[PDB]
Design a protein around this ligand. Structure first.
Ligand SMILES: Cc1cc2c(cc1C)[n+](C(=O)C(C)C)c1c(=O)[nH]c(=O)nc-1n2C[C@H](O)[C@H](O)[C@H](O)COP(=O)([O-])OP(=O)(O)OC[C@H]1O[C@@H](n2cnc3c(N)ncnc32)[C@H](O)[C@@H]1O
Ligand SMILES: Cc1cc2c(cc1C)[n+](C(=O)C(C)C)c1c(=O)[nH]c(=O)nc-1n2C[C@H](O)[C@H](O)[C@H](O)COP(=O)([O-])OP(=O)(O)OC[C@H]1O[C@@H](n2cnc3c(N)ncnc32)[C@H](O)[C@@H]1O
Ligand SMILES: CC1=C(CCOP(=O)(O)OP(=O)(O)O)S/C(=C(\C)O)N1Cc1cnc(C)nc1N
Ligand SMILES: CC1=C(CCOP(=O)(O)OP(=O)(O)O)S/C(=C(\C)O)N1Cc1cnc(C)nc1N
Ligand SMILES: Cc1ccnc(NC(=O)NS(=O)(=O)c2ccccc2[N+](=O)[O-])n1
Ligand SMILES: Cc1ccnc(NC(=O)NS(=O)(=O)c2ccccc2[N+](=O)[O-])n1
Ligand SMILES: [Mg+2]
Ligand SMILES: [Mg+2]
Lengths: 582, 582
């Protein structure tokens, strides 16, 4: 590593922190400047390897860092000033923690001598973010910067990945010092309980259970994002069907005959059927979240549960397993793969009768949508995008109906193609997320499947897309409503509208606001499409036009995401029919 | 009070909470719906007295409630869903606490049985907001709703006003119960240390000090917002000049001969002079914040300090006073006014020599600006707005250069005409704040003096302005930069630009983005003005056109806010000359 400073020569704390980032392999930050972080931004300009993407609001900054992180496997880095800068990161951090996204957040702070005095732009950010980050730090000495950054990146990326925040007082940024880069990390506790490689004692007991079962199911989630090859090989050696959580899409290719697609509340009927009637549940890298389980005692009630997780706090949290393995699923699969490879003819595994039993359910209840006259079905739009991009686009989304359809109707080949807020479910995620994805993946098609409710929340980032000259494609499914809330309104509150309409009550038939004009304000080419016939061409034009593009897709507002298990329900409660129409 | 329910008849917790609001005199909420707050929104629709203004992002919601609160003296109410809804309020709460703004925030939460399980859209909001609210609550029983709401509004509005958050679990919203409205508030500690009326022992000692002083100064702040009459009478009985904090503008009319205008870092030279050389400092409703004091030992170092504050934790926090009074400044002035009225001829007060000494400073160093050819001076634009509105507009602002000029160059007659984020200094405040102001004041001219950096952050609220048909006027001082950061960049970092340019580096002379097109997207009439000559007419057109209006005012980017005391400095360090030019 080549420094920009002599080994014996003092420099500012701000300059130490930036070098600390360079030494971690950081190439991009998302930083919005302010009083308490100016020094860091000054140090940033004199770096040649780190580029800064300036957002227009710091919530854009964080979600952009998440996009960056989710679409690459690298940690996302964002920087903010004290006070209002810092607090605007809060939703992103909470989002990153719940979805296990590696993130390092750096915030400026008032000078140390003023911490606690309610100074200009002061917020006890360490206090505020304690329950919503993996860990955080207040830097109280310039001597500590090398050690804290190293710890921050280590903690953020190791074990169960998560957000780490580092608060840096202005006077520390200014203090001249000589950094020492060979300090030991002060993480003795965390480091002592980092999971060991799985030994064969546990792994052969699982292969034993597989060979003894008649109806096995793979329940696969966000823990498997780095184990696509391993899981691939595991399936071809067992022939066990694969259900997936929303966070796990793409781990196993959605367009394969062994794929049961997504399970859960808006999961496919056949996936939930498989899990309902399975005798062996192989839960790899999941957290038995309420959205997939529903009522707990009814979830895989006839199943022998095997649960592999890198977090011990997750094992036996919601459903208590029969067999458990604590550690990396990649290694567990690698180990299980060898056992299955060696004893292949010794086992002669055949799950034909079970796989077939599922194949009839896949036909009796496949994913379906209605086409009404010339109106665009949102589902069909996503199918056309899938066909035209050849299933190879990076997709980010907002939250709601459109998010579920983007999950249901696009066929993700690899993981890290699907970027979405699952745990927290934060609106205004898709657009800034797309920015991060595109900066991390300069040669890939990046499409933000967004809703008009979500899109508008962080519309200011269209300024960012244009200025940063990024080829973000926006497929806006415009249905004039907060659809997800409207669906629940329709089915539980006698269709009584409670502030879910997003258009203008005066001109109730006019599309409002005009999303094309937002795009024009930022010099981004845009088109609107209303007839289904024009769709195939409109989307093709979006893809072909160089640089950013917005396509406003008008959809009938009364479509419903199906299937649906009402919250806290069972597989028997599954709703497969109906909409907000007549 | 007429209820919508029989006294003996059960109803939902959601319906109890809404009635609790009606019983408090609530007429407006700012609420964005979601999964965990649907029930509240359903209960809201069946209320006939409370209207809901739906924002497009919940940070808009909070700042709108702040606008409402700041421009009326009533508490502002906002409602949000769990998780991402709740976290998006965070900047508003922190803002409201630092500026002492009465606010009640209600958030939905996951059902009680799931608190702590990282459920769908769960955030420990009570944990997160503890250090940034006056108080908060987790409701654990439907029986507690009447008592908690009453406590919430009491705490939010009594003593030193502030934000209070009430977290309400979904199952509590659904539970049927019969509310009891006569419960005693469980605030024995808070209620026992609520300040008593000031007795004459203290007040005559102050009048004694006034008559003994030769160079007295009134240092007046946000504590005086409800004491404009009392302070008015106090001045006409003493003839003591009035300096003001940013939060206190309008308490004493800026356009009066006894007014020293604003003091502090961007305060007038004569105001800071007065305070520097005063022998008696009358600090009424201020908090000796670093922005006005600078280096503490040098601030009024020759002055006898009298400090009246409703918060005992503020008295002797930063500067230790000689004499102090703990309580309401309105009552203290009322008491002091009688003493001064009775002993008028007995004292024969005359501060001519001191007032005159200040009058020469007011001439030697008045507020000034340069006009460059045909380009618009931002200062002059605000002067024209002042003249044309007759000084009677409600003004909200973003944060930065434009905020200081809106403070310096508009002459506020009454308090609660000036709405601005002072303590936290949050960008994207001016626009949603204006919405709250206009909903609270349907017949007043409401103008948001905003900057292009700040404006874009919450540009989505233009959808809100239009749909809610509110006559918000937006005077956008567009200088293509984060000006305040740029000014500091110019004077401390050799003009080295560190991510402060907001336009497009490709088309560097084109105004970017096009703010008129944002306004058009939301069907809001808009015009751009570049030549100074067209300004008088452009602004007049903004005022005359019914409904919302945006005026894009182009300004040379290298203007500097003056005067300026570099942070942590003295009156001797005052900078009165220069800009970002040649
Ligand atoms: C916003 C929204 C979200 C919805 C939704 C509707 C909306 C409107 N409905 C559904 C739905 O119908 N179906 C659905 O599935 N989701 C749904 N969700 C999202 C859901 O709340 C939640 O995000 C996911 O179900 C959780 O994904 P996961 O179970 O993969 O855990 P995830 O959050 O991905 O966490 C991964 C787990 O794997 C562990 N882990 C991480 N790395 C490793 C490793 N290397 N080795 C072994 N363990 C590891 C980690 O400790 C954690 O326990
Ligand atoms: C964003 C920004 C802000 C700037 C700024 C530049 C920027 C870019 N520069 C300046 C500047 O140059 N000059 C300046 O003045 N501000 C400036 N500020 C804002 C500054 O940080 C701060 O907001 C104010 O100085 C504080 O206003 P205050 O001292 O009136 O206290 P404030 O925050 O209004 O608090 C009022 C005080 O009065 C007390 N109080 C409330 N009600 C009563 C009552 N009824 N009776 C007696 N006590 C009561 C309350 O406890 C509190 O201690
Ligand atoms: C408004 C809303 C939703 C509607 C989103 O509106 P959209 O128009 O963006 O998406 P669509 O459903 O119509 O396709 S879904 C939802 C959930 C699942 O909690 N919420 C509540 C919600 C409210 N606020 C934020 C920041 N995030 C949220 N998820
Ligand atoms: C960007 C910025 C400022 C520039 C604001 O840009 P504007 O264009 O809106 O205003 P102007 O100065 O050019 O007239 S001032 C400032 C301070 C005083 O901390 N910050 C840092 C800042 C950054 N982010 C938020 C939410 N609030 C802030 N105050
Ligand atoms: C652009 C700009 C505007 C206003 N202030 C500043 N910077 C500072 O004030 N720096 S500072 O002196 O260290 C400071 C003193 C008290 C509170 C906060 C800060 N601060 O956040 O930098 N920078
Ligand atoms: C619009 C919409 C979408 C999804 N969910 C919901 N509501 C619920 O799920 N209600 S719920 O069952 O009480 C619930 C269970 C677990 C976590 C969170 C909630 N919740 O926030 O309402 N509402
Ligand atoms: Mg929608
Ligand atoms: Mg500007």
């Amino acid at each position: 590593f080549i420094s920009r400073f002599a080994p014996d020569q003092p420099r500012k704390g701000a300059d130490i922190l930036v070098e600390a980032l360079e030494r971690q392999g950081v190439e991009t930050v998302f930083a919005y400047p302010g009083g308490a972080s100016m020094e860091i931004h000054q140090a940033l300009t004199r770096s040649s390897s780190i580029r800064n993407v300036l957002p227009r609001h710091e919530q854009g900054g964080v979600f952009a860092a998440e996009g960056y992180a989710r679409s690459s496997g690298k940690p996302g880095i964002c920087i903010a000033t004290s006070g209002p800068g810092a607090t605007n990161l809060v939703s992103g951090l909470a989002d990153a923690l719940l979805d296990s996204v590696p993130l390092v957040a750096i915030t400026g702070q008032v000078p140390r001598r003023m911490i606690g005095t309610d100074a200009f732009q002061e917020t006890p950010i360490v206090e505020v973010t304690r329950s919503i980050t993996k860990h955080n730090y207040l830097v109280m000495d310039v001597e500590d910067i090398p050690r804290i950054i190293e710890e921050a990146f280590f903690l953020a990326t190791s074990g169960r990945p998560g957000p780490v925040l580092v608060d840096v007082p202005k006077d520390i940024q200014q203090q001249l010092a000589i950094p020492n880069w060979e300090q030991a990390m002060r993480l003795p506790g965390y480091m002592s309980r980092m999971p060991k490689p799985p030994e064969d004692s546990h792994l052969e007991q699982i292969v034993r259970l597989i060979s003894e079962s008649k109806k096995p199911v793979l329940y696969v989630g966000g823990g498997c994002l780095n184990s696509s090859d391993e899981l691939g090989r595991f399936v071809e050696l067992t022939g066990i069907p694969v259900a997936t959580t929303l966070m796990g899409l793409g781990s196993y290719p959605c367009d394969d005959e062994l794929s049961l697609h997504m399970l859960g509340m808006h999961g496919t009927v056949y996936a939930n059927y498989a899990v309902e009637h399975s005798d062996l549940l192989l839960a790899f890298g999941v957290r038995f979240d309420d959205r997939v389980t529903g009522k707990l005692e009814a979830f895989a009630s006839r199943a022998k549960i095997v649960h592999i997780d890198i977090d011990s706090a997750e094992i036996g949290k919601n459903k208590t397993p029969h067999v458990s393995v604590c550690g990396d699923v990649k290694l567990a699969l690698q180990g299980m793969n060898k056992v299955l490879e060696n004893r292949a003819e010794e086992l002669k595994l055949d799950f034909g009768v079970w796989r077939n039993e599922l194949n009839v359910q896949k036909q009796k209840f496949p994913l379906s949508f209605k086409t009404f006259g010339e109106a665009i079905p949102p589902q069909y739009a996503i199918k056309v995008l899938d066909e035209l991009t050849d299933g190879k686009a990076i997709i980010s989304t907002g939250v709601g109906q459109h998010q579920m359809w983007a999950a249901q109707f696009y066929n993700y080949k690899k993981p890290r193609q699907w970027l979405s807020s699952g745990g927290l479910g934060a609106m205004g995620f898709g657009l800034p997320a797309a920015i991060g994805a595109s900066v991390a993946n300069p040669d890939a098609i990046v499409v933000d499947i967004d809703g008009d409710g979500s899109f508008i929340m962080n519309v200011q980032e269209l300024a960012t897309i244009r200025v940063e000259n990024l080829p973000v494609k926006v497929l806006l499914l415009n249905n004039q409503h907060l659809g997800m809330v409207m669906q629940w309104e329709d089915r539980f509150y006698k269709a009584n509208r409670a502030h879910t309409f997003l258009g203008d009550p005066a001109q109730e038939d006019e599309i409002f606001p005009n999303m094309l004009l937002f795009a024009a304000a930022c010099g981004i080419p845009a088109a609107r499409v209303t007839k289904k016939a024009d769709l195939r061409e409109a989307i093709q034009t979006m893809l072909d036009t160089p640089g950013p593009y917005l396509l406003d897709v008008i959809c009938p507002h009364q479509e419903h995401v199906l299937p649906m298990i009402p919250s806290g329900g069972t597989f028997n409660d599954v709703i497969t029919e109906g909409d907000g129409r007549i």
